[PDB]
Symmetry: D2
Subunit: 242 residues, 4 copies
């Protein structure tokens, strides 16, 4: 369990991030949600998680494309929740196109959110975690942080950058009660159609779910994973095995 602990999950207003925030809340961790979408639906999710799990849940609408806003999210989490034990850097965006046709604006945006926000979040969290003698940085990368796919140059580059940054984070904090790891998901979600689309990269022909990724984050945040650091955990149904 994670009672008494505080977890900040970027881009948790929906999808994978919400699945992770939910799983952590279910372990008794207080949560700080983040991301965009419909404000009423967001408040419903925030209020609902707090009630369903008996934990404190706040919403911070910080725009992660801005370095200072990312750092502010972490520092405010500490001010309001009293500490920060788990930081899940999850928010990300995508754009497909040949390298020569890839807009510089899109390249910069993907690098800023998918990679630099990991830097800014981590930088702000580390001083608190070191003083706490406890920390868990969980970066949601991708199978594309380990291998490549055509037409996703910026995304692949940024995700590879995250895996490398994660390793450095682990080395700088080794032995200080802090670990840093990167979860690398395969595809996340007519049955014939689905299996056909997954056939290309995902051998299991099964989609990875937000609940499964949430369970993986919960494991990394547990004491059993105290010595799991600077590594990647592939949840890709065999994507990278071949």
């Amino acid at each position: 369990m994670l009672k008494g602990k505080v977890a900040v999950v970027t881009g948790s207003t929906s999808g994978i991030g919400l699945g992770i925030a939910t799983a952590l809340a279910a372990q008794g961790a207080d949560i700080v949600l983040n991301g965009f979408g419909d404000a009423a639906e967001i408040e419903k999710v925030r209020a609902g998680l707090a009630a369903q799990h008996g934990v404190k849940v706040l919403y911070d609408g910080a725009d992660l494309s801005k370095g200072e806003a990312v750092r502010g999210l972490v520092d405010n989490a500490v001010r309001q929740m009293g500490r920060i034990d788990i930081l899940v850097n999850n928010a990300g965006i995508q754009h497909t196109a040949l390298i020569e046709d890839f807009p510089t604006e899109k390249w910069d945006a993907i690098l800023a959110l998918n990679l630099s926000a990991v830097f800014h979040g981590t930088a702000a969290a580390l001083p608190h975690m070191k003083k706490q003698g406890f920390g868990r940085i969980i970066n949601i990368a991708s199978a594309h942080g380990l291998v490549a796919s055509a037409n996703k140059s910026a995304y692949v580059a940024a995700k590879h950058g995250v895996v490398g940054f994660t390793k450095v984070t682990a080395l700088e904090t080794a032995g200080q009660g802090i670990t840093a790891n990167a979860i690398c998901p395969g595809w996340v979600r007519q049955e014939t159609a689905a299996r056909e689309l997954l056939s290309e990269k995902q051998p299991s022909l099964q989609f990875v779910t937000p609940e499964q990724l949430g369970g993986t984050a919960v494991f990394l945040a547990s004491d059993a994973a105290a010595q799991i650091t600077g590594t990647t955990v592939s949840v890709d149904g065999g994507w990278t095995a071949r």
Copy 2:
């Protein structure tokens, strides 16, 4: 929880294997212990786990150096336990020496146990798991299954082979409710301790059988249904640099 499931752990009469068997027993899984040791000591361990965790625990001392003995362990597990949901290939041995001075005897011994045993054990279990529509093969490799160190060629070669074998197992079982992964541990066990770990383990802290047991429990969980054909490094940063 793993109530109603049966887990076979090779080389579990002590150390890491026992740590894994214990964590699995704590989740409610019936256990099949394996390995060598003192009859009384082993029985104390076996009876103790069964009583403490309220599950059935069998002990099979099959010598895993022989391929038929390995498959026999699995068959005997299904025969006596009724099924096999989880197989943890853990048994292993080591021998240090330069390549030109590495006894061929030792080379063949390390490969037979550290690698071929995984093949034999896996072959025997798959038929049952495929029929059940569920299975978890957890191979305990090592950091040396990903990187290397001087004077341990057979060990490193075997461990690498295990990683490769794990991926194939995963590919052949994809989507059939069966996963296969390899846990790659770093140093497993104050100033001296740190000095000894300083060379390979950044954390300067040992990995524990309990932690590896918790890692096996995670891999056997439903949250890990889509984690297959990969490695989980529990090395305190060993492989990050």
Copy 3:
């Protein structure tokens, strides 16, 4: 030999880049040098290679921290040299500090040059190489593009990013007579902490490696990394 071929090497005014530009010139390739340092020395180098190897050697001092400038380097290279067969993205900088103490300005500068310049240069070169039906993109990453070291977050992240970008480049050009690879050097001048051989890597060796990747013997070597680190990544 690379007679009739044009190679552009970023950051070739010294160290590794110069070692690679030189090695490629010795193979008959025309060269476009780039980078900073002393102007008089740069001219001596440029004229010296052209005369000593009998090839056209040009100098373009484009500041590669600027995307448009990188694209301009390649386009002007096609204008003045007539073609571009080899693109060696080598230019890079470094900064060391704990992540929490790492200046945002340094993180941005390292990503801009060490990673984004590889994108801009590749983006500009591809249209030409595809039309030509030939191309060789060689990115100089680092052992830090495969593993990490404490206090070098921006550098390690950027190098890893380069390794990944190289893989995508290879896949988008697969089979079009174009290959994209990354050379990952170890230390280049206690060396025992990272490099087992206890021997530094040299610009000459790296140059020789670039020549091979540029040769036809490596026509099917693409989307991979070639470690020249004396055992760094082995352990």
Copy 4:
């Protein structure tokens, strides 16, 4: 010395090394025929090379067989064979070449693994496993010879459209390309290239 150089890649590498002016010692089924499936023969072919050739500077372990079948149907017979040659031979060959090279103060061990020494494919458990084994063995060899003038590396080839599934380049790799690669690895430019792999797979492992 180039094992399994009686044809295919082994011959391609053998050839390429010839065009460079290095005395060659062929093998398979000077010339030798030692059965590499026997650690006895393998170790012999090496020492027999330094005997009749005067010395050994480049050892290329290329011998290897294949067999496909689900793991549970994979004959223990085949498994042991694929392992015996595809992997154990590299240990025997290398074990017999090190004392010589170390004394010579120079050496180039070139193991011919496969893309299957880095990734895997269904129904090739024994081959994939021995290949990964080669990669690991190659790395240990380097660490034990680091700074002694000897390097150990592994070439991991792809297919040598029916390759659409594994090779995006959709083009086969050739024995000469592999030969040139071997030539390069033997080059003085590869003095610091040790303990690593070189993938020649048209982008196989990149995705």
